[PDB]
């Protein structure tokens, strides 16, 4: 039914099948917890196989309002309207939703990605043009009896996974679910209270980890870190991996590292532990990230005598982003109803014979400081 209803290509987002208009036009839509607009290509573009044709939908209504959305990467502009929307491999309901018909774009659509639009699953507070444009999931919950919750199991060229709408599929994770509070309903903002690289605390004032916010974002590929944290992390990872020396360009994400097929030296790269604020005062839990996650494979037939990777941790000036490579191998529950995000080990979790991704707790901290930046 809903299990395995996501596809994708590495570094290019995960998408779900949707239909818009009447009769239904089928489109693949990138699932994005880091924005709040539902938008679809609605005019020819070199990288689009198909696009939303408003003239062929009897139920389309123009809202006579333009909209512009700049992301960290890429931007588009379009015309707002509403139409009927469904998810073939989700709940069997049909909802009228706001849709931005994209008429121009810059570095947004990706050659070969196989998606034609984006589903912003965050809150109205960051919807453009403003917060009166009701996001899709809000519309879904208002117009049907779907529980106000969804979960994402992203798995690691072709990738897959599941978006479970309205509930939690227990066959998709093992162990316990640990919940961290949604600090504010705009992005899915959370609080990181501690960061360790191979068990070694980075030793920063914990507000540094959340300057100016930390978010959980399926629509961004990398773990993005504030400059101060990024530099400390790179130094610690370099030192752990010092048995091999890589060009500075690798660490900046401007260059691949490759090894002969099957011989990637996983064991010289450290695990990264991110401790998230718990549901009880001064308690936390950690999720552990292996190099199989933060060294992202770049598929290319020309380089295929080797396995090559990009360093999927990069610097941010807009706060921490726990992107797709962080979510991969975890089952992540976006529990809007109880303003919390849950993490558990995924059915498709990453591991070799020495180490595995984990979600564990509780941990206690004596420093009663608030790690939230504002
Ligand atoms: C999947 C496409 N992709 C591939 C590569 N990289 C590059 C490395 S990276 O992950 O560090 N990074 C900068 C990158 C950043 C983004 C990126 O901005 N993704 C957006 C969705 C999106 C999906 C497909 C194409 C273009 C954009 C999120 O929505 C942003 N969420 C935070 C945010 C920021 C600013 C405004 C805003 O408004 C709502 C929201 C995407 C990539 C990369």
Which residue(s) pair with 32 in the sheet?
Answer: 120
Distance in Å, CA 108 to ligand 1 centroid: 9
Q: CA-based angle 17:23:24, to the nearest 5?
A: 5
From 72, 69, 333, select the one nearest 216 (Cα to Cα): 333
Q: How far is CA 308 from CA 30, 71, 198, 253, 303, in A?
A: 25, 27, 23, 13, 7
How far is residue 348's CA from residue 172's CA, in Å, rounded to a whole number? Answer: 8
CB 176 within 8 A of CB 359: yes
Which run of H or of E encompasses 138?
helix 136-143
> For a substitution probing ligand 1, which of 6, 7, 68, 71 has the most ligand atoms within 8 Å of its CB?
71
Of all protein residues, the one whose alpha carbon is nearest to atom 41 of ligand 1 is 220
Output the DSSP codes for 282-305: TEEEEEEE-HHHHEEE---GGGTT
From atom 39 of ligand 1, which residue's Cα is the shortest distance away?
35
Q: Spell out the SS3 assignment of the chain.
A: CCCCCEEEECCCCEEEEEEECCCCEEEEEEEECCCCCEEEECCCCCCCCCCCCHHHCCCCEEEEEEEEEECCCCEEEEEEEEEEEECCCCCCCEEEEEEEEEEEEECCCCCCCCCCEEEECCCHHHCCCCCCCCCHHHHHHHHCCCCCCEEEEEECCEEEEEEEECCCCHHHEEEEEEEEECCCECCEEECEEEEEECCEECCCCHHHHHCCCEEECCCCCCEEEEHHHHHHHHHHHHHHCCCCCCCHHHHCCCCCEEEECCCCCHHHCCCEEEEEECCCCCEEEEEEECHHHHEEECCCHHHCCEEEEEECEEEECCCEEECHHHHCCEEEEEEHHHCEEEEEEECCCCECCCCECEEEEEEECCCCCCCCCC
Let me know how long the chain is: 374
- CA dist., res. 270 & res. 229, Å (int): 16
Cβ within 8 Å of residue 165, ≥6 positions away = 2, 87, 90, 91, 140, 146, 150
**Calculated CA dihedral for residues 165, 168, 171, 172, nearest 10 degrees:** 70
The Cα–Cα gap between 361 and 211 comes to 24
Out of 32, 138, 307, 335, the active site residue is 32
Ligand 1 centroid to Cα of residue 220, in Å, is: 4
Instruction: Give the CA-trace dihedral at 75, 81, 82, 83, to 10 degrees.
Output: -80
Active site residue: 83, 138, 217, 335, which one?
Answer: 217
Tokens representing residue 316 in the block = 């941010």
CATH number of the structural domain 147-374: 2.40.70.10
The CATH class for the domain spanning 14-146 reads: mainly beta
Which residue owns the Cα nearest ligand 1 atom 22? 219
Ligand 1: nearest atom to the Cα of 109: 25
List the residue whose alpha carbon is closest to atom 37 of ligand 1.
Answer: 71
Q: Whose CA is nearest to atom 11 of ligand 1?
A: 222
Q: Enumerate the domain spans of the chain.
A: 14-146, 147-374
Distance (Å, whole) CA 66 – CA 77: 7
Sheet of 295-297, strand order? 257-260, 306-311, 295-297
Distance CA 74, CA 107 (A): 5
**What resolution (Å)?**
1.8
Q: Give whole-number Cα distances, 257 to 247, 263, 264, 320, 324, in Å.
A: 9, 12, 10, 25, 20
Instruction: Give the number of the atom of ligand 1 that is nearest the alpha carbon of residue 70.
Output: 36
Residue with tokens 């043009």, as numbered in its chain: 129
Q: Is 217 a catalytic residue?
A: yes
Fold agreement (14-146, 147-374): yes
Question: Which tokens go with 244?
Answer: 């091999």
* Minimal-distance CA residue to ligand 1 atom 7: 221
In the structure encoding, which two tokens stand for residue 124, read together? 């109205």
Side-chain half-sphere CA neighbours of 275 within 13 A: 22
What is the longest distance spanned by two Cα atoms in the chain? 64
The experimental method behind these coordinates is: X-ray
> What is the distance in A from the centroid of ligand 1 to the CA of 9?
15
What residues does ligand 1 touch, defined as CB less than 6 Å away? 11-13, 30, 32, 34-35, 71-74, 108, 118, 126, 217, 219-222, 224, 314, 323
Q: How far is the CA of 247 from the centre of ligand 1 (A)?
A: 25
Specify which residues 259 forms β-bridges with.
307
Distances (CA, A) of 40 to 19, 44, 119, 307: 11, 11, 9, 34
Q: What's the 175 CA to ligand 1 centre distance in angstroms?
A: 31
Give, in order, the Cα–Cα distances in Å from 161 to each of 10, 31, 140, 241, 256: 12, 11, 21, 31, 26
Q: How far is the CA of 74 from the centre of ligand 1 (A)?
A: 7
Residues in a beta bridge with 41: 102
The rounded distance, in Å, linking the Cα atoms of 124 and 107 is 24
83 is catalytic: no
Question: Which among 133, 165, 174, 127 is positioned nearest to 146, based on CA atoms?
Answer: 165
Q: What is the DSSP string of 304-338?
A: TTEEEEEE-EEEESS-EEE-HHHHTTEEEEEEGGG
């Amino acid at each position: 039914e809903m299990v395995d209803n996501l596809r994708g290509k590495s570094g290019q987002g995960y998408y779900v099948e949707m239909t818009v208009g009447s009769p239904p036009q089928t489109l693949n839509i990138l699932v994005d917890t880091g924005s709040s607009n539902f938008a679809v290509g609605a005019a020819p573009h070199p990288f689009l196989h198909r696009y939303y044709q408003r003239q062929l939908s009897s139920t389309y209504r123009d809202l006579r309002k333009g909209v512009y959305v700049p992301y960290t990467q890429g931007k588009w502009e379009g015309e707002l309207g509403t139409d009927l929307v469904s998810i073939p491999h989700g709940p069997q309901v049909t909802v009228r939703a706001n849709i931005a018909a994209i008429t121009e774009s810059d570095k947004f659509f990706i050659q070969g990605s196989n998606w034609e639009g984006i589903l912003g699953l965050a809150y109205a507070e960051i919807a453009r043009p403003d917060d009166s444009l009701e996001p899709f999931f809000d519309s879904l919950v208002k117009q049907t009896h779907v529980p106000n919750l969804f979960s994402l199991q992203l798995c690691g060229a072709s990738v897959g996974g599941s978006m479970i709408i309205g509930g939690i599929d227990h066959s998709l994770y093992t162990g316990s679910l640990w919940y961290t509070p949604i600090r504010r309903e705009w992005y899915y903002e959370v609080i990181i209270v501690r960061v360790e690289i191979n068990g070694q605390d980075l030793k920063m004032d914990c507000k540094e980890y959340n300057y100016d916010k930390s978010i959980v974002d399926s629509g961004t590929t990398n773990l993005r870190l504030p400059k101060k944290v990024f530099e400390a992390a790179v130094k610690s990872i370099k030192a752990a991996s010092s048995t091999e020396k890589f060009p500075d360009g690798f660490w900046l994400g401007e260059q691949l590292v490759c090894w002969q097929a099957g011989t990637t030296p996983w064991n010289i790269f450290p695990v990264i532990s991110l401790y998230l604020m718990g549901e009880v005062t001064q308690q936390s839990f950690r999720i552990t990230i292996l190099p199989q996650q933060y060294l992202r494979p770049v598929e290319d037939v020309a380089t295929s005598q080797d396995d090559c990777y990009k360093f999927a941790i990069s610097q941010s000036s807009t706060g921490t982003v726990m992107g797709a490579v962080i979510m991969e191998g975890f089952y992540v529950v976006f529990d809007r109803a109880r303003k919390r995000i849950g993490f558990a080990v995924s059915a498709c979790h990453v591991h070799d014979e020495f180490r595995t991704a984990a979600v564990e707790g509780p941990f206690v901290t004596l420093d009663m400081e608030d790690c939230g930046y504002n």
